[PDB]
Amino acid sequence: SDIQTYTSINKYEVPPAYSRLPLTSNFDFTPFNNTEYSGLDPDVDNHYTNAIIQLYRFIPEMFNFVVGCLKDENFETTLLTDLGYLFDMMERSHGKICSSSNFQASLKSLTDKNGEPQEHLEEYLESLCISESIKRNMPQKFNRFLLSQLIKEEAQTVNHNITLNQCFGLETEIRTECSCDHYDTTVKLLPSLSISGINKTVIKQLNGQNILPYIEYAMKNVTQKNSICTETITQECTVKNLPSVLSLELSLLDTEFSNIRSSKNWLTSEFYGSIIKNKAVLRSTASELKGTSHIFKYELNGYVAKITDNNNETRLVTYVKKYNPKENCFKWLMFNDYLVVEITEEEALKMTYPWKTPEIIIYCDAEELRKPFFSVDTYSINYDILFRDYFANGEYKLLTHDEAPKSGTLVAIDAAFVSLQSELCEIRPKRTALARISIIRGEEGELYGVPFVDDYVVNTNHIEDYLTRYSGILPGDLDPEKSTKRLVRRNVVYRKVWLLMQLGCVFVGHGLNNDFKHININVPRNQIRDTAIYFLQGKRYLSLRYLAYVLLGMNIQEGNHDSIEDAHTALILYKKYLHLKEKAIFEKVLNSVYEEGRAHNFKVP
């Protein structure tokens, strides 16, 4: 049938839900997602991060934490709070399309950077310019990188937490035996387990057989291949921990990958396990244990599979288990970039298909998966940033405590942008960065129409054009080379908009739906008052400089578009439209501009 079918009769034909989906480059997403859980825009420089972000949104322990860090202002930790801004955005849209553009810009900016795993970061700066879709072991490499970087940034949060280490941390002993009766070991906390090098699979005879032997080997193994100065060291790795969440990375040979596809029920639904020997022993039933210890039960949370096409293209998809608490139930979800379909367990766990390869598996503690997902609004969020002045360099009044916005407060917003990279298609148009935004006090009172933020956002990447005939962004957007502008990072100015959307305030402006897509934030419809939808006659949207001239008596004098002037005129236009609707004169004057503007060509100076 149509694209949301996730099973075809032949084991060889790839279903439509797993195929290549049309480029989105206003696109309509309603035939691609029926459920209340969002998908992600595929216009991204990473062919693979979208599948991983979805896998992590649905671990209650990690979702609740990184969303949790959105209480306090964590500006220095970009990747962790941008993941939080994304996670919170995905949760509240409840199905609407989401874009990871903000997060993806943090990842590229941080990747641009004595230390041994600096080759970790070179791998992505290498892979953010693309020629195939995804190469070998690259999903697994990001899984470890992202977890590592989050843990590193998690240490530098407010009220520094170790929470991500408690769930992911694997205490790994590396005993390296040089000579007889003499060995040296190191111990490091590793966020994920890597099933990388396998010599002979005695793990398929009677222990084919399921995944648990493979997990056990990577948990304690000895191998005798190295070099020193012509030594060929024998190394012994062993984990002495069974943490709350278990991040697996699978990279075997294609011969080991086609033999694995016939041992049915290989990828195991649930298993218990503990540490009795100095090795970890995990079995299927709990009575297959000798006791010996505290018993840990693990259920599968989700995993990231690699799809290889009938046209020999590749992409990543995400399987996810979500627990609804009203019923003792599990909703199995499959995620293709913006394709989200609810599947059942027998199809989610199956790997009989040759076009399917597991690459990242996640196991969660059974008691911890049924923990509910908590929005950031269950906490008390720090709103200081709307009242404080915070600039990063050398016309508007900031707000009071009596000006504390509530659910329904009127504010006017306008945003200006510059272009980093143009279309570059064979690919799709990718880059355009935020330059300046302004908010306006929209509530009727003594301070009405007066702005309270005017923030030019710093950006170091080379921009292709300033668009100043449309944006008015004088080339003083450099960090120390402010023309006279008051500059702020992107994470702080996003926090200002996010807090306004957090309280439930109401935004007025022209083309707000567009600006919010480039702010990378999703406002609900009740909180938008777009003059675009009000003063519209089918197609051919009217110029705001025109509406300022024909709906009231202002000559906008359109030189370089002033963000704050635009935000101000849009505010009083929404009030003029409101007055024209207070009595029945709305649709009448709606056509006064339609018929008498054609003789004026919709432009008069």
Token pair of 1 as six digits = 């049938």
Instruction: Tell me the angle at which helices 49-57 and 78-93 cross, rounded to the nearest 10 degrees.
Output: 70
| 237 in Cβ contact with 174 (< 8 Å) | yes
Per 3-state DSSP, what percentage of the chain is helix, strand, and coil (rounded to 5)?
Answer: 30, 20, 45
Is 65:79 a contact under the CB 8 Å cutoff?
no
The amino acid sitting at 355 is W
> Identity (one letter) of the amino acid at 562?
D
CA distance 376 to 68: 6
Give the whole-angstrom CA distance, residue 309 versus residue 315: 8
Token pair of 202 as six digits:
């005695």
Tokens of 151: 């843990």
> What does the alpha-carbon distance between residue 247 and residue 362 come to, in Å, rounded to a whole number?
5
Give CA–CA dist 93/84, Å, rounded: 14
CA separation for the pair 97, 529 (Å, rounded): 20
- Residue 94: helix, strand or coil by DSSP? coil
| H or E, element range at 357 | strand 356-365
Domain coordinates in residue numbering, the chain: 1-380, 381-605
> Around 86, how many Cα atoms within 13 Å sit in the side-chain half-sphere?
26
Q: How many CB atoms lie within 10 A of CB 427?
A: 12
User: What distance in Å separates the CA atoms of residue 187 and residue 182, rounded to the nearest whole number?
Assistant: 17
Inter-residue long-range contacts of 508-512, CB under 8 Å, 24+ positions, other chains counted: 508/410, 508/411, 508/412, 508/413, 508/442, 508/570, 508/571, 508/574, 509/412, 509/413, 509/414, 509/567, 509/570, 510/414, 510/544, 510/566, 510/570, 510/573, 512/413
Question: What is residue 35's DSSP assignment?
Answer: S
User: Would you say 410 and 508 are in contact if contact means Cβ atoms under 8 Å apart?
Assistant: yes
CA 493 from chain centre, in angstroms, equals: 18
Q: How far apart are CA 173 and CA 171, in angstroms?
A: 7
Q: Which amino acid is at 330?
A: F
Residue 75, helix vs strand vs coil? coil
Closest residue by Cα to residue 373 from 333, 338, 321, 436: 321
Residues 6+ apart with CB under 8 A from 235: 174, 175, 176, 177, 222, 223, 224, 226
Pick from 398, 420, 400: nearest CA to 108? 420
User: Do the beta carbons of residue 482 and residue 451 sit within 8 Å?
Assistant: no
CA–CA dist 212, 283 (Å, integer)? 7
Radius of gyration of the chain from Cα atoms? 28
Cβ atoms of 387 and 398 closer than 8 Å? yes
Cβ-based burial of 132 (10 A; exposed 0-12, middle 13-18, buried ≥19): exposed
Provide the edge-to-edge strand list for the sheet that holds 528-530: 487-488, 451-457, 433-441, 410-418, 506-509, 528-530
Q: Tell me the one-letter amino acid at 123.
A: E
Per DSSP, the residues of 503-552 read HT-EEEESSHHHHHHHHT----GGGEEEHHHHS--SSSPPPHHHHHHHTS
Tokens of 149: 């970087």
Strand partners, 220: 238
Question: CB-side exposure of 319: number of CA atoms within 13 Å?
Answer: 31
CATH class of 1-380: alpha beta
| Residue 506 β-bridge partners | 410
Strands 506-509 and 528-530: parallel
Tell me which H or E stretch contains 194. strand 193-195
Residue with tokens 């309509």: 28
Cα separation, 386 vs 398, whole angstroms: 8
Q: What whole-number distance in Å separates Cα of residue 392 and Cα of residue 422?
A: 29
The β-bridge relationship of strands 270-275 and 329-336 is unpaired
Backbone phi, psi, residue 171, to 5°: -70, 110
Which sign does the torsion angle of CA 104, 154, 62, 159 carry?
negative
Question: What is the SS3 assignment for 271?
Answer: strand
Q: What is the C-alpha to C-alpha distance for residues 534 and 537, in angstroms, rounded to an integer?
A: 9
d(CA 16, CA 8): 9
3-state secondary structure 298-338: EEEEEEEEEEECCCCCEEEEEEEEEEECCCCEEEEEEEECC
Q: What is the 3-state secondary structure (H, E, C) of 233-268?
A: CEEEEEECCCCCEEEEEECCCHHHHHHCCCCCCCCC
Token digits for 511? 């083309």
Residue with tokens 């170091």: 460
Residues in the chain: 605
For 62, residues 6+ apart whose C-beta sits below 8 A from its C-beta are 56, 164, 167, 245
Q: How far apart are the C-alpha atoms of 484 and 476, rounded to whole Å?
A: 8
- CA distances for 135 relative to 111, 216, 544, angstroms: 18, 27, 48
Q: Are 436 and 456 in contact (CB under 8 A)?
A: yes
**Is 187:240 a contact under the CB 8 Å cutoff?**
no
- The CA distance from 349 to 332, in Å, is 10
Please state, in angstroms and rounded to a whole number, the distance separating the CA atoms of residues 559 and 561.
Answer: 6
- Contact in structure between 314 and 136 (CB atoms under 8 Å): no
- Of 197, 139, 461, residue with least CA distance to 317: 139
Q: Measured between alpha carbons, how far is 590 from 542 in angstroms, rounded to an integer?
A: 12
Identify the three-state secondary structure at position 17.
helix
The Cα–Cα gap between 315 and 197 comes to 24
Written as six digits, the tokens of 180 are: 């007889």
CA distance 294 to 276: 10
Q: How many CB atoms lie within 10 A of CB 180?
A: 6
